[PDB]
Structures are given as structure tokens and as C-alpha cells.
Design a protein around this ligand. Structure first.
Ligand SMILES: NC(=O)[C@H]1CCCn2ccnc21
Length: 164
């Protein structure tokens, strides 16, 4: 099971870890991807998770979009976890760099409540442009299920823990 996590609350845990390496190690029931509405896994967490699947995540995602159309900002879909997890929950947090409404971050985290346990990144953090400290606060105030947050950047992880 999950090892080395700092317990933030009753249900939120955090670790300075590479989410791809973490997923390969734990093989969780659910790994969350920091997805965009088109499921184009080009960079950040999505680019790293997709590269770990040898592009199988992108091939599956393109078929999903061809059938269903784009996701909503704040929405999600459950697809295969490939070699990383049983399932991948692709969650679209607002991208502040695209001028998307930061208020949608709570809706994005609500998707986590449909899964009893998840390995996840901080939604809208990194290349999505939101403040990761704010993302962690929305996570702990929205998610009620057991979430294991992986924060790649050590300096950001320390800042998140020290300011919690
Ligand atoms: N893209 C991210 O935020 C994480 C994803 C796992 C690997 N990794 C390397 C650099 N940063 C990361």
C-alpha cells in the first residue's frame, strides 16, 4: 500500500514523489491525471503519465474523445490505468493560463469523491497555473475519500507542508 506519506487530515496524505514512479510502485486502484478537456496529454503530469504508458493512454483517450467529445472543465472520465493503475481518473481542473475560472477547482476535486482511494496530483497546479497552496486547501476542504497526493517538486512539497 502507500508508504512514506505525511498525514495532513483524516483523509488527505501527501508525499514528495514522482506520481509515475509512485503509480508503478503501488499500482493503485485509481491514479488521477491532470487532464485537459481534449485529453491531449502533452505535458506536466498528463505528459508524464502518458509517456509511462508508451502512449497507450493517448490512443485510448483519442478514441474516448472521438466517441464522446470533450470533457467539461471541472469534469472527469474514468479510463484504463494501463501499467500504472487499475483505472485512470482524468480530471480537468481549470487552467489559469487559459483564463479558466479558478472556482471550478472545487468541482474538479468533487470527482475524487466517487473513488474510495486515489493517488493524485494537486489539481490546476504546475503548468495549469493555479497556486498549489490554494489547490491543497480546496482538496482538503472538498475531498472526503482517501487521497494520496504526490508532489514532484521537493521545494513545493516543503512549502505546502510548512504552510498547511
Ligand atoms: N509533471 C509533474 O508535475 C510531475 C509528474 C511526474 C514526473 N515529473 C517530473 C517533473 N515533474 C513531474
Amino acid at each position: 500500500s502507500f508508504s512514506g506519506y505525511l498525514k495532513l487530515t483524516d483523509n488527505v496524505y501527501i508525499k514528495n514523489a514522482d506520481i509515475v514512479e509512485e503509480a508503478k510502485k503501488v499500482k493503485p486502484t485509481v491514479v488521477v491525471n491532470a487532464a485537459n478537456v481534449y485529453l491531449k496529454h502533452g505535458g506536466g503530469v498528463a505528459g508524464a503519465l502518458n509517456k509511462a504508458t508508451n502512449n497507450a493512454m493517448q490512443v485510448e483517450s483519442d478514441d474516448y474523445i472521438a466517441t464522446n467529445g470533450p470533457l467539461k472543465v471541472g469534469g472527469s472520465c474514468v479510463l484504463s490505468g494501463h501499467n500504472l493503475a487499475k483505472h485512470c481518473l482524468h480530471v480537468v481542473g481549470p487552467n489559469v493560463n487559459k483564463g479558466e475560472d479558478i472556482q471550478l477547482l472545487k468541482s474538479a476535486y468533487e470527482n475524487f469523491n466517487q473513488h474510495e482511494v486515489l493517488l493524485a496530483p494537486l489539481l490546476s497546479a504546475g503548468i495549469f497555473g493555479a497556486d498549489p497552496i490554494h489547490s491543497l486547501r480546496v482538496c482538503v476542504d472538498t475531498v472526503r475519500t482517501n487521497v494520496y497526493l504526490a508532489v514532484f517538486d521537493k521545494n513545493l512539497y516543503d512549502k505546502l507542508v510548512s504552510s498547511f
